[PDB]
Amino acid sequence: STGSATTTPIDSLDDAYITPVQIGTPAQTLNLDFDTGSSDLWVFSSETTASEVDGQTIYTPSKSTTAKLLSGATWSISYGDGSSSSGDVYTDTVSVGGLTVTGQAVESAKKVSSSFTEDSTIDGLLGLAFSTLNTVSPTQQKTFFDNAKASLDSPVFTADLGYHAPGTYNFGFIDTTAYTGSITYTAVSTKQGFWEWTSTGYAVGSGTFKSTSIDGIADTGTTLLYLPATVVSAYWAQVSGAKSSSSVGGYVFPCSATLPSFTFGVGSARIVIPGDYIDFGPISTGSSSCFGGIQSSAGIGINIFGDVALKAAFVVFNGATTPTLGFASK
Numbered sequence: 001s002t003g004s005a006t007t008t009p010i011d012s013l014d015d016a017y018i019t020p021v022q023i024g025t026p027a028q029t030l031n032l033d034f035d036t037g038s039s040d041l042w043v044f045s046s047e048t049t050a051s052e053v054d055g056q057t058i059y060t061p062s063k064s065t066t067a068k069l070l071s072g073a074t075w076s077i078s079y080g081d082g083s084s085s086s087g088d089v090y091t092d093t094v095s096v097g098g099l100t101v102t103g104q105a106v107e108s109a110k111k112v113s114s115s116f117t118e119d120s121t122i123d124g125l126l127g128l129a130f131s132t133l134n135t136v137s138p139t140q141q142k143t144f145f146d147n148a149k150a151s152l153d154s155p156v157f158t159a160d161l162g163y164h165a166p167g168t169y170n171f172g173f174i175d176t177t178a179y180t181g182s183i184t185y186t187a188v189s190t191k192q193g194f195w196e197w198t199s200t201g202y203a204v205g206s207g208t209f210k211s212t213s214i215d216g217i218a219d220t221g222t223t224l225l226y227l228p229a230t231v232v233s234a235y236w237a238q239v240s241g242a243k244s245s246s247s248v249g250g251y252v253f254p255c256s257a258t259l260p261s262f263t264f265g266v267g268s269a270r271i272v273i274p275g276d277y278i279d280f281g282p283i284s285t286g287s288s289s290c291f292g293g294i295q296s297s298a299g300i301g302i303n304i305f306g307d308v309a310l311k312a313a314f315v316v317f318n319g320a321t322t323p324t325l326g327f328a329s330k
């Protein structure tokens with residue numbers, strides 16, 4: 001089997017991407033944030049505290065003939081940005097882009113943090129990291145990908161995120177028309193439950209490439225690119241007037257600037273992030289200070305190749321017995 005679904009930016013900044021997902025019978029379509037940095041499929045639901053729902057589409061398990069309470073199971077998750085959610089669990093039929101899993105754990109939110117309430121366009125998350133990170137207790141549950149894997153033509157999914165445009169998540173096949181050149185594969189560590197890999201270095205603009213190992217995670221659920229302070233300082237030093245602002249919470253730059261590109265290494269290959277991808281616009285409406293798309297990972301504890309990086313590439317998440325990541329230019 002295979003599946004293919006279009007993923008769409010939620011706003012003009014590509015702050016996140018949503019992908020339609022069919023849950024239950026008859027189908028209830030919710031727009032979920034596919035998240036390769038977590039392993040829970042959770043949704044706004046008829047059980048979510050009313051004051052914490054603001055425009056989202058909800059899953060109502062009582063209207064699904066295939067929903068079953070997973071008796072006694074609860075979940076609770078918190079993300080690196082400080083967001084969180086929690087609730088109980090149903091199993092139901094879930095389909096993505098024509099690919100169907102029966103008996104998928106669908107985690108129904110009773111509570112969500114304000115960040116989720118405020119994101120009217122995001123009806124929940126669909127985790128695509130390793131199932132060892134799943135938060136359901138007392139019986140840990142498998143991700144949609146993990147459940148689908150044995151049925152897939154190939155045990156892979158791909159992320160092809162657009163810059164200010166829709167893109168695609170494919171399951172079970174590699175679309176050889178979706179990228180240029182060749183895909184370079186690199187080793188993954190699953191020890192922390194993430195798609196964790198080691199970049200071989202970086203360059204700023206037309207500058208020389210610096211060979212240096214940068215461990216990090218491929219996280220479609222993080223907006224920005226978070227790298228070591230040394231690397232990030234070297235980037236922003238090439239932008240006149242750029243500075244780190246403790247008041248704003250990161251590097252800002254004059255909105256009159258033209259940003260240089262940023263290159264990261266994948267083995268002997270190189271992925272170039274155009275300067276435009278690094279512009280996250282005015283810090284507040286009407287401001288001439290703009291927020292940068294490359295920020296320090298210091299005080300996160302891990303480097304994060306978020307959407308800013310991933311959208312510059314066609315990315316293969318290879319879930320074979322020994323997982324690997326592949327990157328191609330596009």
Ligand SMILES: CN(C)c1ccc(C(=O)NN)cc1
Nearest residue numbers: 035037079080083115221222
């Ligand atoms: C507030 N929202 C929509 C979030 C979405 C995703 C994440 C995240 O860290 N995913 N790996 C955090 C927050």
